[PDB]
Structures are given as structure tokens and as C-alpha cells.
Amino acid sequence: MWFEVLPGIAVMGVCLFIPGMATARIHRFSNGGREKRVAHYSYQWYLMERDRRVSGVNRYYVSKGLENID
Amino acid sequence: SGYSMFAVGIGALLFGYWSMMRWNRERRRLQIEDFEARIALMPLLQAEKDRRVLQMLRENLEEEATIMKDVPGWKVGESVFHTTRWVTPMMGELYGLRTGEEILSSTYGFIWYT
Amino acid sequence: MMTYIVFILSIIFVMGFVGFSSKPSPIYGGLGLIVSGGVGCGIVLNFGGSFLGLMVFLIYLGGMMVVFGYTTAMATEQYPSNKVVLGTFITGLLMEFLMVYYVLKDKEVEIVFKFNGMGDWVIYDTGDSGFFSEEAMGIAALYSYGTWLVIVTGWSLLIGVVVIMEITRGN
Amino acid sequence: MNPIILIIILMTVMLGTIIVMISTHWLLIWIGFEMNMLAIIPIMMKKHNPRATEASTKYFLTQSTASMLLMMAIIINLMFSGQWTVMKLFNPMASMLMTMALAMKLGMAPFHFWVPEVTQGIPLSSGLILLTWQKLAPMSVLYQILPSINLDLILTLSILSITIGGWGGLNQTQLRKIMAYSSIAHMGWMTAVLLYNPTMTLLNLIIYIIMTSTMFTLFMANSTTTTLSLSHTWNKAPIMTILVLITLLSMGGLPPLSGFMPKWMIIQEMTKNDSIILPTLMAITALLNLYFYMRLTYSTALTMFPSTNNMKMKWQFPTTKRMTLLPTMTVLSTMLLPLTPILSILE
Amino acid sequence: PGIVELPSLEDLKVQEVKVSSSVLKAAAHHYGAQCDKPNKEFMLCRWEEKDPRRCLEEGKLVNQCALEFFRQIKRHCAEPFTEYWTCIDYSGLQLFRRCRKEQAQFDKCVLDKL
Amino acid sequence: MFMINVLTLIIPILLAVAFLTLVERKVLGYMQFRKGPNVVGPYGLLQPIADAIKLFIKEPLRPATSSISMFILAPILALTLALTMWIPLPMPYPLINMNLGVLFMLAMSSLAVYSILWSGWASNSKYALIGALRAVAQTISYEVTLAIILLSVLLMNGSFTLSTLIITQEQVWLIFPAWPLAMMWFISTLAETNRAPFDAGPFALFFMAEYANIIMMNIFTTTLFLGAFHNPYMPELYTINFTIKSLLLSITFLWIRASYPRFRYDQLMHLLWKNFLPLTLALCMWHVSLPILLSSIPPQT
Amino acid sequence: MNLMITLLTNFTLATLLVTIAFWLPQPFSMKFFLVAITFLLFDLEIALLLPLPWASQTTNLNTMLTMALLLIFLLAVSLAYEWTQKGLEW
Amino acid sequence: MSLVYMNIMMAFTVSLTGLLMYRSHLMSSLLCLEGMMLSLFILATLMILNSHFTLASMMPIILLVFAACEAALGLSLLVMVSNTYGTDYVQNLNLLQC
Amino acid sequence: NVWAKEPVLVASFAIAGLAVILPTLSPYTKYSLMINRATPYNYPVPLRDDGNMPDVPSHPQDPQGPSLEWLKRL
Amino acid sequence: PFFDVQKKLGVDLDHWMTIQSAEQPHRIPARCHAFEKEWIECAHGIGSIRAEKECKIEFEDFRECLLRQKTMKRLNAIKRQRDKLIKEGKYTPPPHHSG
């Protein structure tokens, strides 16, 4: 019956299971554990630009908050 | 079963419409909160923008005053326009003599990021 | 691999227009116009250009070249290149290269104009805080302002339908 | 070709001309010219002969490249001082391309190679509507953009239009090519005045449209394509003879008849400038374009060609068409000499 | 034509608010509550007279108001404001609907001690 | 690392196509009474990979020295469309966050129609070319219906951005406020994948283009009308339930491939125009006139 | 240009695959015509319609309701016109 | 002067000469007219984008829909010409003489 | 009648007729216009001090101005 | 003729697509807004010829806002002089990121 066809469907579903998990792993890996900041509009990009400017390392994932005031 | 199938289809349809209506109104509440965020946040960013563009303008006028001392004519800060108003700079007045990396990050950065 | 990407895409755009303006076989002309439309979409998207440039790609390379190649193929074929076409393509390429050289090693180029020779990353906007995607709200008019405009546009489309059926044997 | 469909298509021709007239924006000008094209194609091919097909093809290619040249001129206008108003332009190159687009649109002498061909292979109703409306509607646009035109453009095209529409025209025995060359001569006569006083241009447009309506109505009353058929219409009925006589002599522009009010008032408000050699050259060519009218009249109603019989059989059956408006347009087109102070009806 | 006048860097140096975008977006409504009474002088100046190099004094005043507001939120209640902005940080585009528990915690904190 | 993201997109899709071939053949074998074949390879996997290398290494009987440029551009376009068009599809976090992607999907569908036309012209002036011209017509007459239906089902999103689509699909699905519109969209996907009931080389690569186009339309279906609740700091749950729904809908796509006869072309065009196209118009004007009825216009940000 | 990077990588992969696959073997109907033009015209009206969801929020919703219903109603008028006038048949 | 405008106007003149001089075909001429349409579309759209002139962004989409239905009319006329003949040459239109 | 000849067309005309008629008679269209109007895209600008208006409140917490409440009040 | 049923009926069908500085859908400006506002308020009730001979200065100001011809000319001359003196060999320049 279908007891023998579920391995083929299972391995093809694993082939549809790897790429989104690898993409999410690389987004978490390439932003310091953060989700990737999307930029739909010009406002979020200007806010992201001043984010990457106030880092000092010219990288927008550090985000260096609340201990830079004193 | 045709009348009953028609009835259960229209019933599930109307249930979907009612739930979608309720979720869209709560979604509009959250979008108005996003507008509150951008409104209350704005003047600080406007002040930083003004200070940064005036800083690049003063720097670039001093750079021009160094770089053009070997030509006839040429005052150092010549307004192209006739009327004396603060016209918005064109990113060439801002991002000039910068050589590549920062001008590609600043001009075309939003267009081929995201 | 440098800053002049709008200029490079404009050069390959003119390459494609010459490549089908040298009068080839019409299916090769359709291929050249497909290449030209793709790189022109790239140009208008690099000015950004989010909505409308890819919008028209659905129409111009989504709803036109199909019918063009369709009526190209089913009408006539004329299976055989010719030296006049290759000569015109060489003259077009030479005009392209001469214009590129006199943009590069000069200041200005005059047909009757003064083109400042540098790739235009400037002029361009100084990053204004939109939060509404200006051209998308632009095209999000025609419906609260476009009273007369969409009426005459749809009217001409209805007349286009009745004209096509009349010429192709109304009724 | 249902009557509802014909009423719809004629209403769209009316709507295209109204959108050309009425708007203060360039997009509706282009849409008006374009809708006028798209609607005026199936007034042609009302028959199904390949003559009308090839004529509509030629007209479509020339008309469409004129429309695209117009759009090029408007986009150059927005490259310069940027607004979509119908006023003075801001580039001699843009005005150059735009006047060449409208010159292809309504016919000048480097551009007129589509006009006799497209009038040859079509019926008379389609020729009537294309001549009247297609030479009416862009005159409004030239009237609106007249303060920003290089003069050598208009005046070279007008001189050349009058002399080529005169010279080409002494060699055609067809009716429609004679009427097309006459149209080219009157486009030249309207265009040469346009930078001086445009009231003369609009009044000449009114007079030429009334004259062409009388001419094509007197050819719709009796189906004729050659002058031999005009002599057989001498034989069948006598009033058509004298009205072809009077309307041909009013196309010629003779002083007691009402075809002289367009030419002579143009001479007046041309020579109140210091242009004299140009009026005498234009009016000697106006002497030239009367000869084919006169040989037409000698064929119709002054000599009498011998006619085939079966007119003996045609005599029992009277001319039972309906005319569009023949007698009113005839007496208004030919007996309107002493009302020249209806010049000032127009401002 | 008449050349332009620009202020030099003897005046264009206020100590910037050197926090990033995440915490500055997260701290929006209370920034609108306590402060942003004198920013509308700056914004009215900017909208009436379309000239930066004119309203920069009020830009300095709104910048020191923002810096004093963040100093006050550092001194008083609380420490889990750090928890709040690091909770809104990693949520992609910053929805105000994901991390709402700590928003309630922060509101109870600020109602207790401020 | 971005080219590594490209490679981890495009390596699994080829394995996905070949194992889709084994899955469709064996589930035909367990719907119709042919319990097999599974002898070559344990549970039938070495037979698809050997089938791929067989279509690689097959003797040509070579007819293919006609019109080099068109003959090299048709399969390259079909395969580059089918292999590049999983990029805006939001498997949990998409590869490129395009601001508008569904119109991009429709544009690439029309470019696949171009590749079909190029192969038809390269088929050398034949009754096969006339059949390919009819295939072009029955492929082009559904990008009207699919675009208008897609328009009305994204009208409840408000924007094209498709992350707003994954926002909208959390409370209920998008199958319940539009079940007939989704039904007609599913029939339009059956038409666009050019398979039953709606019906030279490299045949393996046009085969590749067909099956990657099918899995694209199924993943686009599973995003567009179905799905699970996305959770941040846990994307693997959304990956699991998204893959399960896409697999179940692909098996149902096979389950409709098996048990229906083909349609005559008169019936196909009559079917499309005189049954779908007024009903699409009516459902679309009702989905236009519903947000003014319910005070629910979606927030374009 | 990052999608240009993706597109260039996939084009090079597909081109190397096809070059390995090719360098290592080791009359007319008018009824066919009208469908394409009818596609062309209705797809142009689709291009008019489909910026409706970007438009769905404005101050004057009744004007948008009126003109959007006029657009789809004209599309239905043209479709029903060629339906009644026996055009698209076989 | 925004250098890309120079090459796009150059491309316009290229497509215009390709429209005007043409041999023994009409489909290629109409296809070059379509290319000229694309040139006008791209040129006007880069202008409207760089000028932030947002309310009159209807020019590119309306230009292209209207000139697309022009192209549809031209294709129907080409099909009628090839229906009343065998081919669609610029030749064999020599009747209806000047 | 016509339900047995072409049923899907008649169903389409019926749902189309309710799509034409029904947006008039509704208790929500004025609510739609209020929700759609009262979302601020741009900055609500301050203005010059006094014409002694009994409006335009000086504090964003002051309830002397026109605000929305029916988002929360269903 | 230029008929004005446009003005007689009181319908604003063609006065919003037309010019800049109108009411945009969201109340946003243009790039060269105030230049056209001053130019139009210069040449409003003027007969289009002494509008040329009197409102020319603001018109050239608006044109050099629109295309930015002379400003790009100035930027081009700056870069060419930069090139000739860096080829001459004076001050490999630290104005970028420093002084």
C-alpha cells in the first residue's frame, strides 16, 4: 500500500525542508543573532543608515544601546 | 444535498468575512501605533540631518578652497542660483570627492538593498 | 563592477536597439526587443522605480511580444546573414563606441545639448524620509483624482475591441 | 456595420476632436489624436476591397509615426521647463519636432505622399470625414501653440505645400486625387497666415470645410469617380451641372463668388506686415491651382460629352437619395461674398 | 552671484544621542510624553522659515532634551528597559505587537517611579 | 555568504524535481493498481538518479544543427526561470525581500510562455508548430484569469509585499473568505502547468522546467491561501507545516492528474472565457466593494 | 544587483549544464488570431485595474468605488459584446 | 544633464531610423515602432522619477497602454494585408498608385 | 427559466448586482471614511500661537482636540 | 480654437495632472516646488511676452533647479582640476574620512 511510498514523499519533503531552514540559519548567523532588518521604505533605510553610522564598526548589528549616554 | 451544500458554503464564507473584518480593524490600530512612532521620533532625526548636511557643506567648501587656488575667476562658495535661499543639495554638493564605497552605500544603497 | 551601472545598462540598451534596428528576421527582432526591454527595466529600477518599471514588464514583456512573435510565426517565415544588415550593425556599434569615447575623454557632447560627461549617480535625491513609496502613491491616484482620465482610457479600450472585431469581420 | 456601431464610431470621432479642442493638458491632446486615428480606421474599409485595406495601412503608418513624433516633442518639453500646459514651448527643437508631427498629421508637401493614395481607394463618406475632421482638429493645437514656433518651418512647409499641391494636380483625371491635391493647397493657405493673424486661419478652415462638403455632396448625389461619369450626370439631370459649375468656380476663388473671401482677407492681413513677395508668389500659385478645376468644369457643364444610352432607362427613375445638407451649404458656400464683416464673428 | 554663508564647526557640535535605531524606536511614546513640549518651537521654526542654518539653536535644545530624557530613563526605573529594547530588537521590522508583556512591565515601572 | 545562500536554494530544487518524478510515478502506481515498480534501488531512488544520467548520456540521433541561437536560448530561458523563481517565495524568511513579488511571479510566467514559443519556432515548421501555437494560446488565455484572481486575493493584504500576506494569514486562512476564487485559481494553476486535464531537446531540461514550475505554483499556493502561523525565534515549525501543506497539495494535484480525461480545445476556450471570465469579474468587483462595506481596508504601511 | 548576482550565478550554472549536455555526448486561422488580440486588450485593462490595492486608502472612497466599478463594468461590457456578436467561436 | 538621457535619446533616433528605413517587411517595422514606444516610456519615466513629480506619473502607463492598442490595431491590419495576399511584403502594395 | 440555461452567468449577475447596490445601504461606510481619514502620514505641523481659538490644544495629552476613540470602542 | 467648457462647467478634470505645486494625493512637495511657485506668481496676469522680458531670472533659476546644469558643470571642473593636480603630485588627499 502507501506504507512503501511514504519514504519517497518523506525524502522529497526533506528536500523541501532544507533550504528555508538553511536560509533562516544564515540570516541568524550573519546578523549577530538578529533577524535581518528589512527595508521596505526610505524611512527605515535612513533609520538603518544612522544605525550603521552610530556603530563605529560600520556594521548595523551591534546597536550599542543606552550605555553611550554618560 | 445541493441546497445544504450551498448553505454551508455561504455560512463558512460569511464566517471568514467576519473574522477577517475583526482582524483588519485590530491591524489598523497597530498601524496607527506605527504612525505615532514615526511622528514622535521625527524632530531628533531632522536635527541630526541638518547638522550632518551643514557639516559636509562646510567641509566641502574648505576642500574646494584648497583645491582650486590655481585658476582665474572662481570665488570659493559661488551660489549657482540667483535668489538667496537654502536650496536642497543634490548629493554631488554633498557626496563629492569621496571615491566609490561610501557613495555607493549612500546613493544606490537603498535601491539594491532589500 | 563599479559605480556607472546606469550608464552600463544604458549602453547595453542602445546595443539591443541597434541589434534589432538593423532589420533582421522579425523573430530575431523580437529577441532583441526582449533583451532591450529587460535592460530598460533594469535602468528604470535602478532609478527606483519599484512599482512602474516592473509593472510594465508584465505588459511590455508580458503581454506584447507574445502576440508579436505569434503573428510573426503564423503569417510568414521566409527561411533562408545578409551583408547590409551586418554593415548597419557595425555602423551602429561604431556610433555607440564613438559616443562613449567622446563622453569618456572629453567634458561635453553636443548634438544640440550640453551633456556633462560622468555617470549620473548625481543628480539624485538626498534620501528623503518618505514612508509611503512616492511612485506607488502616484499610481494610487487615477481613482480619487482621475475622473475624466480613466473614462476616456476605458472608452478607447472598448472602441479598440469593437474596431478589432469589425476589421476582422464584424460581426 | 450595424447602424448602432456606426453611430458609436462617429461619436468617437466627435469625442476625439472634442478632447483635442477642450483640454489644457498634453496627454489628452495625444489621446485625442490617437482615438481619432483608432476611430477613423473603420470608417475606411466599409467595403472589403484590398484598395481600402492598403489605404488604411498607409494612413496608419504615417498617422502613427506622426503621433509618436508628437509624443517625443512633448517629452522634450517636459525635459525642459516642466509642466503639462498647452502654451508657449521652451525649445526650438521641441517646437521643430511638434510642427513636423502636425505637418505629417494634416499634410504638407514633403509629407503629403499618403493623401491622394488614401483618398483613392476609399468611398466618398470616409474621404469627407477624414478631410473635414482630420484637417479641423490639429488646427486648434497649432492655434494654441502659435507663439513659440520658428517661422521658417511653417512658412517653408506652406509655400512648398501650395506649389506641390498645385503642380501635382494637373495630371489626374480621378476625382479624389484632385480633391486631395486641393486639400494640400488649402492646408498651405491656412498655414502660411498662422503666425500673423489666426482668425484668418480658422475662417479659412470653416470656408474650406463648407466647400468640401458641397463638393462631396454633389458627388454623393450621383456615384462618379471619373469625369466621364460627370458628363453622364450632365445628361441625366441639369441642376447638378450648374452646381458643379458654381462650386468648382468657388473652389477656384473668383471675386463675386464666395471663394475669394478666404484668399483676399489673407492677402490683407499678410500685407499689413512688410511681406509682399510671399503674397504675390502664393497668389500666382492660386492662379495655378485653378486650371484643373477649369478642365473639370469643361468636362462637366460647359461642353457636352457624348453619352452612352441606358440613360434612356435611367430617366424613369429620379435621383431619390437623401442629401446630407446640399442646398443650404451650396448657397452659404457660394453666395457669401458681401458678408466679409462676419470675419469678426470669431474672437 | 552672491556666495553662500555657512556656519563653521565652531557651532555645529552638540553631543549626539549615540544610541542606535532599535532603542530609539522602542522609547518613542514616553519621549513624546515628558519631552517634546519644546521641540514644536523647533518644528514650527523649520516649517515657517524653510532654512536650516537658522533654527539650529532649537535643534541643540531638542537634542539636549532627548539626552536629558535618556539620562532620566537611565537613572530612574528601570533596568529591564534594556530587556525591552533587546526584546523588540531581534523581531525583524519592529512590530509593537510581538513583545507586549515587557511593554506592560515597562508601563507599570514608569507609572510606579516616574 | 550570499552566493552560499544562492547555492543552498538551487541545490535542493534539482533533487526536488527528480524525487517529485519518483513520487508522482509511484503514487500513480498506488492509485492505479500497479504496486510498483521498486526493484531498481531500494524503494526507487537509484532509478530516478540513473534516469537523470540516462537522459544526460543518451545517444542523440542528432537532428539539432538548425538555428543555434534560438535552440540554445529556449532551454536556457526555461530553466533559468524555473530555477531562479523561488527567490521571492517566502519560505520562512525569503531570499530577497522584494517590495512587490507576485507581479514578478506573473512576469516570469509570461517569460516561460516566451520560451515555449521559441521551442515551437525551433520545431521546424511543422504540425508540431501548429500544436505548439495552440499550446501558446491555451497558456496565454489564463494569465488574465490568474492575475485578476490574484489581485482580488491580495486586495485583503492591501500591499504586494507578501509578508503582509503572512501577517493576514494568522487568524483564519484565506480559503474561507474566498473559496470559489481559490477554486478558480487552482483550476488556473492546472492550466498554467500545462498538464492533464488541460493539454525536440533537451527534453530533460524542458521536463525540469515543467516540474520546477509546478513546485513553484504549489509553494505559491501554500503561501497564498494556506499556511501556518509564523513564529519568530522558531522558523523550523513554519518550515515543517509549510512543507507538509505543500506536499499534501501536490499529492492532491496528482490525485486530479490521474482520474480525469483531457478536454477538447473548443471546450477549453469556451470553458475559460464563457465560464471563468464573467465569474472572475463578479467575484472581483464584490471583493472590491466589500472593504467599503465592512470598514476593513488593509493597512498599506 | 544582489538579484543580479543570483541571476548571473543561475545563468552560468544553467549555461555550463547545457554546454556539457551539448558538447559531451559520450496556413493560418483567424480564430487563432483573435484570442491574442483579445488577450492584449483585456491585459491592458488589467494593467489599468491592478494598482487598485495600492489605492484602497484615500479621502474620497466613493469616487474610487465609482470609477473602479466603471472599469470592471466596461470590461464586462466588452466581453459580453463579443459574446453576443458571435465573435470568439469556432 | 543626466548622461543616461543622452544615450536614451540616441536609442530613440536609432529606433526612429529603424522605423523609417525598412525592407520587404511590415512586422519588423511595427516592432521597431514598439521599440520607439519603449524608448519614450523609459525616457519619460526617468524624468518623472528624478523630478519627484508624483501626481503626473500617469504619463508612462497611459502612454504605453494607448500605444499598445495602436500596436494591436497595426497587427490586425498586417493580418488583413497578409490575408488579401500570400505574404506581407512592402512589395505587392504597388497598386493604388500615386 | 434562466437558472437552468446558464446558471453561472446568472449567479455572476446576481453577485454583481449586490456589489453595485449594497455599498450604499450599509452601517459602515461613514466608519470607513473616518478610519481612512484619521491616520497621519505626514507630520501634524504646529502653528502660530493665538487667534484665541477654543480648539488646537497646546498639549497632545489635553482632550480639547478632535481625537479618535471608536477604534477601541468597536 | 481653444474652447473653455473646461472653465464653463466648473469641472477640474485637467487642472491637477497639469502643473507642479498642485495638491498631490498625500500632501507632499516636489523637488523644485518653490521655484515654480515664485515663477508662476511672477507671470500670472502677464501677457506672455513681457513675462519673458521680466520673469526671466526666476525662470532660469527654476531651470537650473530642474536639470542642475551649471552645478554639475562646477562639480565636473572640480573633479578635473583634482585629477590634474593629483597627476602633478601634490597632496594625496585626506579630505575623505579625515582632514
Numbering used by the authors:
A (entry chain A1): 1 to 70
B (entry chain AM): 30 to 143
C (entry chain D6): 1 to 80, 85 to 175
D (entry chain D2): 1 to 347
E (entry chain A8): 1 to 114
F (entry chain D1): 1 to 199, 217 to 318
G (entry chain D3): 1 to 26, 50 to 113
H (entry chain 4L): 1 to 98
From the paper:
The ETC is composed of four large membrane protein complexes: (1) a H+-pumping NADH-coenzyme Q (CoQ; ubiquinone) oxidoreductase (complex [C]I), (2) a succinate-CoQ oxidoreductase (CII), (3) an obligatorily dimeric H+-pumping CoQH2 (reduced CoQ; ubiquinol)-cytochrome c (cyt c) oxidoreductase (CIII2; cytochrome bc1 complex), and (4) a H+-pumping cyt c oxidase (CIV) responsible for O2 reduction. CI is an ∼1 MDa membrane protein complex with 45 protein subunits arranged into two “arms”: a peripheral arm that extends into the mitochondrial matrix and a membrane arm that is embedded in the IMM (Hirst, 2013, Sazanov, 2015). In mammalian heart mitochondria, the majority of CI is found in association with CIII2 and CIV (SC I+III2+IV; respirasome) or in association with CIII2 alone (SC I+III2). Here, we report the isolation of functional SC I+III2 from ovine heart mitochondria.
Because of the hinge-like motions between the different regions of the SC, we carried out focused refinements on distinct sub-regions to generate higher quality density maps. These focused refinements were performed on the peripheral arm of CI, on the membrane arm of CI and on CIII2, resulting in reconstructions at 3.8–3.9 Å resolution and improved atomic models for each region of the SC. In contrast to the isolated ovine CI (Fiedorczuk et al., 2016), subunit NDUFA11 (B14.7), the traverse helix from ND5 subunit, and a few other peripheral areas of the complex were well ordered within the SC, confirming the stabilizing role of CIII2 on CI. On the CIII2-proximal side of CI, the four-TMH-containing subunit NDUFA11, which directly interacts with CIII2, is shaped like a lipid-filled arch, contacting CI with the ends (springers) and CIII2 with the top (crown). The dominance of lipid-mediated contacts between CI and NDUFA11 may explain why this subunit is so easily lost or disordered by detergent when CI is extracted.
